[PDB]
Amino acid sequence: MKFKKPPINNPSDDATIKLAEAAVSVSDSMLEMAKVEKVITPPSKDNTLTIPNAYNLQARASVDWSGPIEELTARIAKAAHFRFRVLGKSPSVPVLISISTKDESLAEILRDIDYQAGKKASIHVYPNSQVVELRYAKIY
Amino acid sequence: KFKKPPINNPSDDATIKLAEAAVSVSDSMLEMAKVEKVITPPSKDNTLTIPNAYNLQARASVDWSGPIEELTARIAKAAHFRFRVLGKSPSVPVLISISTKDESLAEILRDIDYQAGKKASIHVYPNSQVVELRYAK
Amino acid sequence: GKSPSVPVLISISTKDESLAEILRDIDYQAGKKASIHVYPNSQVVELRYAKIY
Amino acid sequence: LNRFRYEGAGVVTGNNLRTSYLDLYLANEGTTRLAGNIGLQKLEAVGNGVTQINGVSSRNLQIVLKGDPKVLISGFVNLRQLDMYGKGTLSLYWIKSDTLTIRAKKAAKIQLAGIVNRLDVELWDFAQFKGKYLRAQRSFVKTHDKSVAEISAVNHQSSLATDASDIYYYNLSKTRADFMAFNGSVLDMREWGQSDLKDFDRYNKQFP
Amino acid sequence: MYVRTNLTILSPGWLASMTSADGTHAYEMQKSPVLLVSWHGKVMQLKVEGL
Amino acid sequence: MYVRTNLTILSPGWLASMTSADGTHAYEMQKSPVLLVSWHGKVMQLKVEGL
Amino acid sequence: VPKLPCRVDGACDATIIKMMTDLNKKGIKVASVGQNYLISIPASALFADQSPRLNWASYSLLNEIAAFLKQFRKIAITVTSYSSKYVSVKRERALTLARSRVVSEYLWSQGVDSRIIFTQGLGSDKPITSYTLGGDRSPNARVEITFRRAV
Amino acid sequence: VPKLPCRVDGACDATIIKMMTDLNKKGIKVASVGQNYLISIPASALFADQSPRLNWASYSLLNEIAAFLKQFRKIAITVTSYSSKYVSVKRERALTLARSRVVSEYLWSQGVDSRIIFTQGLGSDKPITSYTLGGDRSPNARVEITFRRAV
Amino acid sequence: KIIDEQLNKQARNLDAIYDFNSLVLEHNILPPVLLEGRNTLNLADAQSIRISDRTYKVAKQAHFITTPPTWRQYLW
Amino acid sequence: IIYYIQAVIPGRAWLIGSNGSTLTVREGSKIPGYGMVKLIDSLQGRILTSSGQVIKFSQ
Amino acid sequence: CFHPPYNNFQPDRRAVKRVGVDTGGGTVGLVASIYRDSKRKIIRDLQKQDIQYVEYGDTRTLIIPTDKYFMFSSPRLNEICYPGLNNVIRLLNFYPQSTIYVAGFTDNVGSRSHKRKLSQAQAETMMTFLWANGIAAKRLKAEGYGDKNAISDNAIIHGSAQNRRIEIQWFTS
């Protein structure tokens, strides 16, 4: 004789309600901008050709890091047992990235690192020589 | 006997909506950076390859931050290779900044070329063991 | 058309009519501000604002 | 040439025979070479015979087997149903169909490759289903004790293992669901050294 | 405010900075009771008083 | 009086008005304690206190 | 004085000592030298035989080991999976990879504030016992957790 | 602050629960899902055989369901009337149209707080069961009221 | 106190969703801030109105930045 | 135009072109627009031919 | 005696163990068993859980909350509410001839393709789960829609929580 409905949770907070109500419109705006930009400029290639995948690079990982990139790439080189190398100089303005994902390939993690780097630094791998080498933007 | 759920599960509906929004905006931003990012082909990559000669595999602890001409002549003399230059020294000298304790001198020269970029370049002949510093016009 | 900034306000009080006459009635009530057309061959009800000024 | 039933240690060789349909019922070592282009719908081998057919193309075919044959057919067949209850081997070159039912009881060595829109697999015991190079839109596989199956699912994959049952997929299905009861196993057995291997996404990241 | 450390200070905006040859960073910036750095990929707060 | 909502104002008039891309409405009128809105075809009066 | 915490929260070193000795009496290998801590578990107390299915009671031991691992300050943990020789190389390589993936996912679900989880499995390439009579009961099949305490 | 109304007048959730349970045991189907509510009444509880006339006993039930519907806050109401095949198609459609019109008129003229009420009927054109043995006693002969609770 | 506790409770999705650091241009410069307006009408007085379809305003100009901001100087 | 791969046995393969045309190819075969296939792969879905292109599956 | 992992996909045997521990009267165990396996107490236990059961005419429908029964943003089936799933199996064993339509629904935020993929994946998950319990593969049809038809508005928080759902419809003949 009782009557219920399916979704029942622990109670909420109105400030969290207002935060989510901002966040939905923010998400829609960002989706709008990204869709229009992708439409107006068509890409040509991708970083898969720059970064292939070889054996021992198929170990898995899950991460949460929010710092300068150098400790992160040194740790991933120590995982891969690869020769780690730098090129150029890190500028006085540091490069900070934030990755919080779940169970990815090392190669896809590195491609995400390059994409979030964008026009500040670039990454390359010589797999046969087993080397991960970065290069900062040699400009300014 | 007992299995627990994850601790910071989004139990609350506001948390559900918020985390979903975060996932959506993360994938959108990664998409936009991907569609705007400029890459380079690994065939047209104007970079110095490894010269893979025998003598270039010594360990050196090198600190320098200044002109490049004395540095390349000094590492050539350390390598017992001949060295010459093709081009003219400009008024403002080419400047570099390299400090390391143990690398290959060959990839050190590769880093010299990479910091040089446009105005300078380097060739190496291993048969007649020479290093050539090529200036730009 | 373009919805103008000044809203177009319609008050209706009527019981037990048909849809077509409701449509014709409110199109008459709008008058010089808008127009309604119906394409029943394509099942499309279309309205238009007034291109004025 | 309508119905051909044979027993008793025969060798028949033929090529360039044109027919709409004929029914073969072979027994007791029929060594057959058929290098023609023949449509047919039914075939029966009683047991303990080896038969290789080069070229069969029909709109339809229904086949069951009873003994221990060693058969292989070349061509394209829109098969529907296949049941194996003995100690049989089978291999087809191409299949272009939509609905496939497979029942395996005792010992089957089946080698198929082609395009099937919907595949159902039942394996009971000592089944060795090598269905690699066989792309499927929908795959539904149920394996009981000591059954090994090799699948190549593309889009929708459903897998169940009771115990001591090996199920090896070979492609990244856009939807994967797997279950094991007592001692089952769902595994990839991929290569990992390819230049263009892709990882999972948020839609198929199922943890066994 | 003048601060010597070896972490990477993020939040309140630093006016100028320099580095040693060994990873020690030197910052000078406005007055704030609070700093916000990155340690090892974890963000940390820093309480400063005594102004 | 500076009023933001997503309703439609009726009675006192206003001097200026603008609308967002989502249907939000922003208005500009003189001092008044009350407002009129046709919310969903139904007339409502809104109380504004503390003028 | 109450404005600064006197210790890292959720830490009592007596309780840490007690749970370490409890795990050693339970039969779980715990070892350390300086800052490098390693713990080793045979796979027979977790999985089915040559299988990536998990017993229900094993979640309790997973809860206990997560409660131990919440104590220290950490950065990167590495979990490796090891097995015996069964059919191929691919079979046990995939088995170790799957087992490492499962234990990594549930560990990440639990609240251990490490920045990095590395998982890898190698199958049967580096055994630690020449006596190879047993199958999955033999202690060469195992899982290892390695990390370094920091400051 | 205290002069503002604490609740919507003429409303109590306990009264809502009690009257919907009474309707449910009375035999009229009550259906609640999300914010959209459905109430369906069999036709022979309201009319005589194939006839667009109201029996005098039906007005008590009509008053009851009107007092139920006034409790919520609505914008749009929709009523549908359905029947069985008798002679024609348009004859049954016209019967449903008349029935829905009559009940819509009475519900409007009673003090319910709707804004817009649509009425239409079709008859046998959208059945709900394969049991067509009964005539106007058949359970598919029905009237449905649907609305959405607005905030 | 409770809302500062809740904002510390939900942490990583907040700086995840408010990525300033991808918004930075090539030369470490904060992009400037723009505002929109749809369907403007203002009446000045009798016999005097002014309408416009879309309006846009620059709020604050672009400049150099030594660090990307966070949400803490907006929400704490 | 392009082609696509359908099923691969070790030695022979099934191919579908852009216009829906079908082919079954040997170890050595001739395809106009692409020439002569030198070798195939059965573990991988790649075809090595005289024109230097590599065929793949649908995405 | 039992296993929490879905009783290892065996035929679940609750009543015989119940009458065994009841005899440890026999008629008391019998009346307890016929109270427990009765459909009314099954529906009431589903109402004690968070599952919505609706019968109307001959079409029978079931509604399951995805946020409760699933790990977040995932096609992973959450393992906590296995008593609810056992109740689901025991109820749906009753009509072994009706075909099954199953569908999934999500809210209104994000990429439409992403919503469609998530709903179709969850639909295939539930379909596979039912397929793993003695149901022939021709008896099912799965579909995952996006936000094509809500039951409550997604601009208010509780309705937005209500909107995503799992829908199970089945017929009679």
Author numbering:
A (entry chain GD): 23 to 162
B (entry chain Gd): 24 to 160
C (entry chain FD): 110 to 162
D (entry chain GM): 113 to 320
E (entry chain HH), F (entry chain GH): 311 to 361
G (entry chain GK), H (entry chain FK): 38 to 188
I (entry chain BC): 76 to 151
J (entry chain Gf): 208 to 266
Paper text:
Legionella pneumophila is an opportunistic pathogen that causes the potentially fatal pneumonia known as Legionnaires’ disease. The pathology associated with infection depends on bacterial delivery of effector proteins into the host via the membrane spanning Dot/Icm type IV secretion system (T4SS). The Dot/Icm complex of L. pneumophila is one of the largest known T4SSs. The Dot/Icm T4SS has as many as 300 protein substrates, a striking contrast to the H. pylori Cag and B. pertussis Ptl T4SSs, each of which transports only one virulence factor.
